[PDB]
């Protein structure tokens, strides 16, 4: 069966990753993004080893992101040190902590998540989500913690923080997000004069919006705004897919940074399939796009031992003419791939069995 083949891929991929990473590292975004994918695979397949792997990581990180208790030193610009408690890259771990709590509730699992987010929400600042990726990192924290606490402030602040991000990064004409406020046209252009939208950036946003819509109460007063943006972003994403099924690093300018890239493509394949499967996106319009994307992921990105290649690396240096390393993988790329694959299983299992 088509669905069973994709389940087998999920186990090959996730097994490869876990085999090659027996030791856990820090709670920061790249590891945390992998865990969002591992949790998805656990929800789909119930394989006990997957749950154990995320529990081990959470325990290793003491159910915390950045560790500082000195609130006056807490920062939300980029940093990797323990003062960066309010930086969303140190909050995506809370998504996994909340998931683990939901399976086996224990106060300590979400204590830090609640302490940090509730302090953040008490501050006047509206500008916590100042880069596109932050939307994936933190929006689902707000919805997951709402569903646990039933504290409406989480949903009010989800709106306030996203409204800020949208105001700076969303291009209404193009229907896509800039990676941050420095990349806006016309001051910045791609090397061939196009608007420059980073594929992984928009991937984070589309996938993040899918996760918000998954868990947000159907009655939430801001839900229609999120749906509306999800639909606009999806349409623009679909429109700039390459003929080969992937999205290039600069979504609207294939020559700027040529050739395949996996992480953006995988996040889009998740978000678009999720939106079709959950009644927000037009099936007939989007399914062909998803099919071309999955074809790329399964044939070109995926290696037969389970390695996920063509992932744009964090440290990349690149100029026009140069492609991504076929053998480039990462934690967050595997996470994105797992999201896409899991959602594909859900789609395939919906189809009539003849």
Integer Cα distance of 237 and 246 in angstroms:
11
Burial of 45 (0-12, 13-18, 19+ CB in 10 A): middle
The resolution, in angstroms to one decimal, equals: 1.3
Tokens of 218: 């159907």
Q: Looking at 133, 196, 202, 253, which residue is catalytic?
A: 133
Q: Transcribe 111-149 into DSSP letters.
A: HHHHHHHHHHHHSS---S--BTHHHHHHHHHHHHHHHHH
CA-to-CA distance for 139 and 150, rounded, in angstroms? 16
Domain 1-354 belongs to what architecture?
A: Alpha/alpha barrel (1.50)
Q: Does residue 212 contact residue 140 with C-beta atoms inside 8 Å?
A: yes
Within a 13 Å sphere around the CA of 171, how many CA atoms are in the beta-carbon half?
21
Question: What's the rounded Cα separation, in Å, for the pair 276 and 270?
Answer: 10
Q: Structure tokens of 6?
A: 């994709």
In this structure, the number of other CB atoms found within 10 A of the CB of residue 72 comes to: 6
Matching residue, tokens 């991000």: 165
Q: Is 133 part of the annotated catalytic residue set?
A: yes
Experimental technique of record: X-ray
Token reading at 232: 């606009």
Q: Which helix (H) or strand (E) holds 53?
A: helix 48-60
Alpha carbons 75 and 93: distance in angstroms, whole number: 17
Closest CA to 116 of 140, 144, 87: 87
What is the Cα Rg of the chain in Å? 19
Q: What is the DSSP string of 282-297?
A: -HHHHHHHHHHHHHHI
């Amino acid at each position: 069966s088509s669905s069973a083949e994709v389940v087998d891929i999920i186990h090959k991929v996730n097994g490869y990753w876990q085999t090659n990473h027996p030791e856990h590292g820090r709670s920061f975004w790249d590891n945390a993004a992998y865990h969002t994918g591992n949790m998805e695979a656990y929800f789909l397949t119930n394989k006990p080893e997957y749950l154990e792997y995320s529990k081990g990581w959470a325990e290793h990180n003491e159910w915390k992101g950045a560790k500082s208790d000195h609130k006056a030193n807490w920062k939300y610009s980029y940093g990797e040190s323990n003062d960066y408690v309010l930086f969303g890259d140190y909050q995506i771990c809370f998504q996994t902590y909340a998931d683990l709590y939901n399976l086996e509730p224990d106060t300590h699992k979400i204590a830090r998540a609640r302490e940090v987010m509730e302090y953040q929400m008490s501050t006047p600042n509206n500008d916590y989500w100042w880069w596109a990726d932050g939307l994936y990192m933190v929006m689902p924290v707000m919805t997951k913690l709402y569903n646990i606490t039933k504290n409406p402030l989480y949903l009010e602040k989800l709106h306030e923080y996203l409204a800020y991000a949208d105001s700076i990064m969303y291009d209404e004409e193009a229907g896509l997000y800039y990676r941050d406020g420095k990349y806006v046209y016309p001051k910045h252009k791609s090397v061939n004069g196009k608007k420059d939208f980073w594929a992984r950036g928009d991937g984070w946003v589309l996938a993040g919006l899918a996760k918000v819509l998954k868990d947000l109460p159907e009655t939430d007063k801001y839900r229609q705004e999120y749906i509306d943006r999800f639909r606009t972003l999806a349409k623009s994403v679909a429109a700039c897919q390459q003929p080969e099924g992937y999205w290039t690093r600069s979504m609207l300018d294939a020559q700027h940074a040529p050739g395949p890239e996996t992480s953006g493509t995988a996040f889009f394949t998740y978000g678009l399939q999720w939106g079709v499967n959950n009644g927000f996106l037009d099936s007939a319009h989007y399914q062909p796009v998803v099919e071309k994307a999955w074809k790329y992921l399964s044939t070109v990105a995926l290696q037969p031992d389970g390695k996920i290649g063509y992932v744009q690396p964090i440290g990349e240096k690149a100029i026009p003419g140069q492609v991504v390393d076929a053998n480039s993988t990462s934690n967050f790329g595997v996470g994105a791939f797992l999201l896409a694959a899991c959602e594909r299983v859900r789609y395939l299992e919906s189809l009539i069995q003849h």
